[PDB]
Write a protein that binds this ligand. Structure first.
Ligand SMILES: [Li+]
Length: 188
């Protein structure tokens, strides 16, 4: 009953009892994933999080936590598919839990620039961010087929699905990633 569901992708796996839980690192007191969820809630009424470790902690801010299917598909596409299989509604705006500075016109600009494509993603002027992506329902069967086929490559999938990049080069450092504790330390 809203047009796009926002989704924070907080990672899959724990293919060696985790390591650092990136989404739970705190940037100025607030977990990175909650920075992203808050930014998505500025622009979208319905936001959920895909998390596969420390689920009770993710649950504490009162959003729906969605875990990956038993299929244990690889890579960020596995989380995308698991969320489309467990949420209704025609459009999803995915964003990793690592990009706390995403802007309040993310959804609006991706939608304005979608131009009939079933998926679009952010390009920051330097690189693609294919997991910051507005994705239509129609992608779900294609994603299932790709991951059942043993594939993992994100950009290859986005190309196969007929997507395109949307230029956010004018949004300075809104798309920076905080992948390690060492980077985070800098941004405080
Ligand atoms: Li642990």
């Amino acid at each position: 009953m809203t047009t796009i569901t926002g989704v924070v992708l907080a990672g899959g796996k724990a293919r060696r009892m985790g390591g650092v839980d990136k989404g739970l690192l705190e940037l100025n007191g607030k977990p990175l994933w909650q920075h992203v969820a808050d930014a998505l809630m500025t622009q979208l009424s319905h936001v959920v999080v895909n998390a596969n470790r420390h689920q009770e902690i993710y649950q504490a801010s009162g959003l729906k936590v969605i875990e990956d299917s038993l299929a244990d598909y690889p890579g960020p596409l596995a989380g995308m598919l698991s969320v489309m299989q467990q949420e209704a509604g025609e459009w999803f705006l995915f964003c990793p839990c690592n990009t706390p500075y995403i802007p309040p016109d993310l959804a609006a600009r991706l939608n304005h620039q979608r131009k009939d494509a079933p998926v679009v993603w952010v390009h920051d002027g330097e690189r693609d961010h294919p997991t910051i992506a507005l994705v239509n329902r129609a992608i779900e069967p294609l994603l299932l087929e790709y991951l059942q086929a043993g594939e993992r490559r994100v950009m290859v999938f986005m190309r196969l699905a007929g997507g395109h990049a949307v230029d956010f080069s004018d949004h300075k450092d809104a798309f920076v990633n905080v992948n390690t504790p060492e980077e985070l330390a800098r941004w405080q």
